[PDB]
Design a protein around this ligand. Sequence first.
Ligand SMILES: NC(=O)c1ccc[n+]([C@@H]2O[C@H](COP(=O)([O-])OP(=O)(O)OC[C@H]3O[C@@H](n4cnc5c(N)ncnc54)[C@H](OP(=O)(O)O)[C@@H]3O)[C@@H](O)[C@H]2O)c1
Ligand SMILES: CCc1nc(N)nc(N)c1OCCCOc1ncccc1/C=C/CO
Ligand SMILES: [Cl-]
Ligand code: NA
Length: 166
Amino acid sequence: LVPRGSHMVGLIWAQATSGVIGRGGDIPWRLPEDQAHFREITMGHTIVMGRRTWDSLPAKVRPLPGRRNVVLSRQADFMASGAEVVGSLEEALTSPETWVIGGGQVYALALPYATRCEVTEVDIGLPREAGDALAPVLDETWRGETGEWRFSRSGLRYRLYSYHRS
Ligand SMILES: NC(=O)c1ccc[n+]([C@@H]2O[C@H](COP(=O)([O-])OP(=O)(O)OC[C@H]3O[C@@H](n4cnc5c(N)ncnc54)[C@H](OP(=O)(O)O)[C@@H]3O)[C@@H](O)[C@H]2O)c1
Ligand SMILES: CCc1nc(N)nc(N)c1OCCCOc1ncccc1/C=C/CO
Ligand SMILES: [Cl-]
Ligand code: NA
């Protein structure tokens, strides 16, 4: 459970088996099971994203509904209609439960404060290319639960991981 006086920080991302999460300003696959899982985990909570992840959402869909949207930017003139733009994790992590929803820069920024990671891994061979966004690497303070391989309606294998630490 999450006490209302606490500040719990989780990271949620989907990756190829290579660790790639983003390429050319987008996610280089689509997986409906992952979209549903992302919604199930984050609904009702604050979501924090980097400015480039805000840019990657079509204007018509943002801010993502049912969640307080917070965008990290260092640009004093960047504005996100419907959402709050802050310049640091300190300002972004004021809710009792926050999910950092990407991308690569912001996962690495938020990892020192996080105690949970929820990962979808898609079994698509997408090797790391220059400029890709990548999943954060998790050291031995993290302990993980790895689900068995499942099979999507779209014909891709995928599996879920849940990581925790103190
Ligand atoms: N597969 C997934 O789960 C997933 C999830 C989310 C995103 N993505 C993909 O990942 C890519 C985006 O990731 P990315 O690493 O390029 O960018 P990002 O992490 O989404 O955003 C980077 C921006 O965040 C701001 N920022 C970074 N560090 C900051 C700090 N310390 N303080 C304040 N603001 C800070 C900066 O904005 P300013 O430049 O405005 O200062 C920076 O340019 C896209 O391809 C996207 O589609 C994938
Ligand atoms: C559903 C993707 C996803 N999955 C997991 N597991 N964690 C995340 N942090 C995550 O990114 C959410 C922000 C980026 O969203 C999108 N970016 C590009 C194209 C489509 C979307 C989807 C929006 C809502 O379906
Ligand atoms: Cl969503
Ligand atoms: Na996930």
